[PDB]
Amino acid sequence: GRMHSSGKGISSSALPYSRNAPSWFKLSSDDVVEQIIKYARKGLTPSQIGVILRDAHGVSQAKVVTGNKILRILKSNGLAPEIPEDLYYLIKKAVSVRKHLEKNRKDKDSKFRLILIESRIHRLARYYRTVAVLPPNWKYESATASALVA
Amino acid sequence: GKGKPRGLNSARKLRVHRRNNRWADQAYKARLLGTAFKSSPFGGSSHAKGIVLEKIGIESKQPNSAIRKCVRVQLIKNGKKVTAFVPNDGCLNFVDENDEVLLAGFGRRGKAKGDIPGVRFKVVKVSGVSLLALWKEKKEKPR
Amino acid sequence: TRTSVLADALNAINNAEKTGKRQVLIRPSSKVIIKFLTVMQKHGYIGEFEYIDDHRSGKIVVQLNGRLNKCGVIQPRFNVKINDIERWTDNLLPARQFGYVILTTSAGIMDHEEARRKHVSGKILGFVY
RNA sequence: GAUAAGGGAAGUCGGCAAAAUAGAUCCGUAACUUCGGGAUAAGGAUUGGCUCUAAGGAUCGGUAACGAUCAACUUAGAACUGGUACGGACAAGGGGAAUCUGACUGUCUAAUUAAAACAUAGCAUUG
RNA sequence: GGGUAAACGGCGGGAGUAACUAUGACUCUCUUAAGGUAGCCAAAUGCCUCGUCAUCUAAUUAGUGACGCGCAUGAAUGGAU
RNA sequence: AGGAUAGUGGCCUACCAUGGUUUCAACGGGUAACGGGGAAUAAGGGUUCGAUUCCGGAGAGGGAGCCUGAGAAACGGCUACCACAUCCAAGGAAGGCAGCAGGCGCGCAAAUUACCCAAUCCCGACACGGGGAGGUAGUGACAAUAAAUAACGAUACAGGUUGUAAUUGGAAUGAGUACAAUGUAAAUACCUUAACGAGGAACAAUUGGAGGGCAAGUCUGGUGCCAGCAGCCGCGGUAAUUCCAGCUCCAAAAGCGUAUAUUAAAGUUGUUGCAGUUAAAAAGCUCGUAGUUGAACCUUGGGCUUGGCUGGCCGGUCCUGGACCCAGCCGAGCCUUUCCUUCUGGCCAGGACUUUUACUUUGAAAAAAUUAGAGUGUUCAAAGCAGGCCUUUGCUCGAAUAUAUUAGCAUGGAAUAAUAGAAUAGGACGUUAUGGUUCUAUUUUGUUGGUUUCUAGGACCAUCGUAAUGAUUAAUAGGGACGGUCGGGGGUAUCAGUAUUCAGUUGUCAGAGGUGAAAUUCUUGGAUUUACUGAAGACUAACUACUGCGAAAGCAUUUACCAAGGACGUUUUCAUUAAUCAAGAACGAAAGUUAGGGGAUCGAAGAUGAUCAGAUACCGUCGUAGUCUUAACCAUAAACUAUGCCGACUAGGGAUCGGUUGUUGUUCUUUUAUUGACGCAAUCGGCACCUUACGAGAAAUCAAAGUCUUUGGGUUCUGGGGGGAGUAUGGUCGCAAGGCUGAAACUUAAAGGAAUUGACGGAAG
RNA sequence: GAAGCUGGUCAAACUUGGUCAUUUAGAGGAAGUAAAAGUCGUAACAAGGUUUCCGUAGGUGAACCUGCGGAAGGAUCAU
RNA sequence: UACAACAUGUU
């Protein structure tokens, strides 16, 4: 179920069985890669890039049309974010909640949700340090929180 | 399920959990606190001796009506005062104030017995001779 | 979350058996589940079972013949000496002439009589009778 | 103004008076508490002289982490030494356990009463 | 005629009553503006009085801790800490 | 580095560094703790005991220090001090029973100041001596073995062929005593034995019971809720099967009872294997570290040859086995892209290599005694390890055999569960690919001590040469993004609304108020009642429900802003990031606390009127805190669904809220679209509900409280008869009120749960 | 080569202060429990005659009463 | 409107 609530929703994208591109789709693998690079260079997280590709270029899964996943392609062409986008978005949400809270000191539900969000941030940062994606001594702190999202 | 861990490396939790909950059993708790050594009138002994201080009659509890003859006794080993029942018909006349009696438990390992409230001991011997012998005129009270 | 897929499979099999179902769907599947099901099939307790490929973990549909009383897992997978199998068969099995204690051994997954023939032991896996 | 054997408040309304303590370094420090204190609590050790050693700097000159020139007294350690002395004169808290009472610092009967009296912050009432 | 006590001030008697005795939770009656509440005490406030018990001492009209029908304790005439 | 020691070592010294242990429980405290071999109980798993016949350690009243000696920090050795204790002529001197015996003390609790080196064995200069070590006896109902207290006839009986009766005889004998020998170091005892040794065979069996559990009396007398019994339930009040006795009967018997501890019964400690809705027990609720636990996936199928065992066609049957065949099981070798370290000798014997573990198999080794167990007429048995035969100058089987194993050392397997690898390639193989350097070097000009690269081997540094060059799914786990929504979720401003109270203006006059009924109270100064305006604080009616949101507590007027959220939709993204969680944190109704501000209304306390026997209660009238808000505390509720959380599965139905997906005889825009509402089918998530009883339960009841003796998905917390008691104490938090943590003594036979029948109700029909 | 002497070293023992563990006296005070037929009321069990109970805060001879907010374990599964 | 209580122990 949901990690920080009682919800048990199952609404997820359902990947197709076929691992080959459809016969009606004809775009070069090099073309799809350069499209990925163009979208990243303008500035777009891999989730955003995948959404645009699927919506406007018939690119269902970039994996089946390039043989490799988007974030792996970005790392192979020097476009991997310094902070993984999961952690980046969690820190951004925490910054937004903190800035809301500094005015509304009597909003106790916001304080409770801040605790939950920061718990998720620390668990994810722990995971990333374990797989050496983040430096061994990387640490999220609220005082420098706005920097990494700026 | 079952509320207890089953992991194959959970022996510490299981053993410590059993150790904590064994304190809820009276016999284990008594033998590990050493309450017989520290608070039992006999100090853990099966029998004890003492000097008779006074004869007292104790009203039997409901639905019985009687006077159970007993003696107030001061123990020798620790100076404690206990009440002991003197069991048989007319055996109270065999015991007197200042006599030395041998006491035993009263059958229920520290509890009262029957309709006699607050009495947990019984007289076995007086002046070095058993009451069963005196009651049956098998011996004589020494002097 | 899911901590033993063998446990889910055997529970689903037993529950479908008790309701009179001729067939049970198992999800997900695994090598251990398939080996255990093979041991149960070789003794006739189950019929044909079929593996569906979903490119994720697999599903299994089993043909139940109604000859099975109980299948279950022994969890945790206790270590068993060669001569501690006696107590496990005494405690888990209806009698000394039918039923099986399934062991995973370095010689492979098998039942306890095969383990005695090969003089091998390992960790207990479950039972069937 | 001094000293005094043995005793050590038996003196006396009352330890009045006197004695005892005392500097500095190190150690150690209870109840209670308004958490700020109590506290130098209590209570221990050390301290001379002499001969040494180490540490703490400034200005010049180009891994200068160096060389040169100059300079104030603090601290720490060691050896040696004596009729065991040494804050050697001077200077310099006695301490503890409680009760009554006023919270505290402060103030008054010049010339017999300094206190528990007065004041005080805080609190309340009145126009 | 109404209000007002952090205004001045005030804040009770007499009989009976429990299966040893004793005591009196309980009852009756007289009466007040109200009948001393929370606390505290032989206290710098208690006469009787060197009260009674305990502790302190060889021995204590002293000290301290208790007790309380308190001659005559007691709440900003502030009570208890 | 030294000193010291027999020697290693912070063992000690000097100098230097700042280390060492710990929630996987250090450190500290307690032990009515010497450890083990072992003992009892014992389905299994367990629980409890072990001072004590053997092994190891420590001590000799308490400490410390030593001499001698191979060996002692010795105590039946010394020195000193402390404590005990002895003699004395008063100067002085002598001590160590936790060795044997014995005494005092202590206590519930334990034996002679005996005999002896004969045996076991030890010591010495030793064949000879010594040994309270040891052995022998005394005491000895610790425990254990065997085993008397009677046996048989005939008369009269009797029975239905002897099962049953009193009075009629003869034998049998060991308890006891004692010649004797034997036994022994000498004895004592046993064993053999002469003479004795039984009618009440008085040479006389007891201990507890006789309502139930639990075997055996309603027989007699006594007592009369007394005396007493009674583990428990109970008995006893003038017909007691229960007390005191008599008789009779029962159980076990040289033994039986009592007390205490402990084991089984106890699945009432539960890993196997308990219970937590209501009987005891789910933390108020979320976060969260340690701990425990964690989706799936990587050599699978096939063929040939071949060794051993079981039953059968060959039967070969003397339980023995035979080409081959029917089967089955367990081995071994090659081939399939083929894993097995690499090279040298040429299925052993050498160099250079080696990812770590858990797990399981097999071996060596593992004091006796004890346990199990084979043999064996100790007269049997407990026991012991003896013994048995042709009959003596002798012979002869034996003194087995298993159990030990957590840890360690060897050893096969490679499932299960982990661990590391090639991703900014710093990646693998080039053996016979080339070069540059450098090191170690055999063979050398062998006449002794020199050279440098062709040279042998490491080892670096490049170039190039091969390779299919090298990255598992993305889980109806999780996380993140994106889209349109949906909410009485939160916060801050803002807009309402009537009502209540209080007023100021208007108008009339006798009452108004309140109750089951009154009274206190207000009223001609006009109370109450009517209309208008106004001032205050609260609150958010009606809509409003088996409906919504939130972690819970909770959340309901309008609007705007702030950030947050579930669900849904997704062919977006990461890739195990997860579950539950000691310690540690956020929030937490009401009441309560502090300081300001407000204080309409209700209203603890208080005042007061009634009812009442009394009511310092219910009822009536006031009314202080409080109720509201701001900034801080407090942390508790029947904080309840009295039901932990995550995950999987198991039976039917109709509704409802949110999202999405297909679709009309309907209403609305427009009569027509990309309108809105409504209607009809599918799904995902919710709050719930209905039927049945699969299955569960003691039942009430439960779609979970099911999938639980056919007992095991992961994990946290709690309970162990009722009380004492959530008390005392220590700690800790709080301004306080109090919160959290949290015993014991002692007491007691039930307390309790669900349901049945009845009775009862100031309950209904 | 004896007594004796110097400097060390191990260090008994005593005195004072600290600390930990166990036991223990006490005026008085406040509880708990037990014990045929004593007193006062009647709080609970029926709508127990004011439904009961939980938390919190006052009050009161006593059971207990009252305020605020909860629960049904209600005397209502319902308009 | 008002309605308090019923000594001990059994067979």
Ligand SMILES: CN[C@@H]1[C@@H](O)[C@@H](O[C@@H]2[C@@H](O)[C@H](O[C@H]3O[C@H]([C@@H](C)O)[C@@H](O)[C@H](O)[C@H]3N)[C@@H](N)C[C@H]2N)OC[C@]1(C)O
């Ligand atoms: C005073 N009685 C105590 C009672 O308080 C309780 O003690 C527990 C004690 O068992 C707990 O401790 C226990 O549980 C911890 C666990 C938390 O890790 C274990 O580590 C520990 O070994 C275990 N003894 C301790 N943490 C708290 C006490 N109140 O249970 C034991 C007791 C003796 O009955």
Ligand SMILES: CN[C@@H]1[C@@H](O)[C@@H](O[C@@H]2[C@@H](O)[C@H](O[C@H]3O[C@H]([C@@H](C)O)[C@@H](O)[C@H](O)[C@H]3N)[C@@H](N)C[C@H]2N)OC[C@]1(C)O
């Ligand atoms: C054992 N024999 C039975 C015995 O059970 C006897 O008991 C009753 C008992 O049930 C009565 O009943 C009692 O039972 C319970 C409980 C103790 O059983 C008591 O708590 C309660 O006072 C009372 N109801 C009590 N008055 C005593 C005997 N008359 O009833 C008759 C009997 C034959 O003597």
Ligand SMILES: CN[C@@H]1[C@@H](O)[C@@H](O[C@@H]2[C@@H](O)[C@H](O[C@H]3O[C@H]([C@@H](C)O)[C@@H](O)[C@H](O)[C@H]3N)[C@@H](N)C[C@H]2N)OC[C@]1(C)O
């Ligand atoms: C039920 N509440 C009771 C209250 O009613 C009162 O009860 C007494 C009770 O204790 C008395 O009884 C008591 O005292 C008698 C004797 C010494 O008087 C004893 O024999 C008896 O065992 C004992 N329980 C009884 N005789 C009268 C009741 N009202 O006792 C106090 C109490 C416990 O609160």
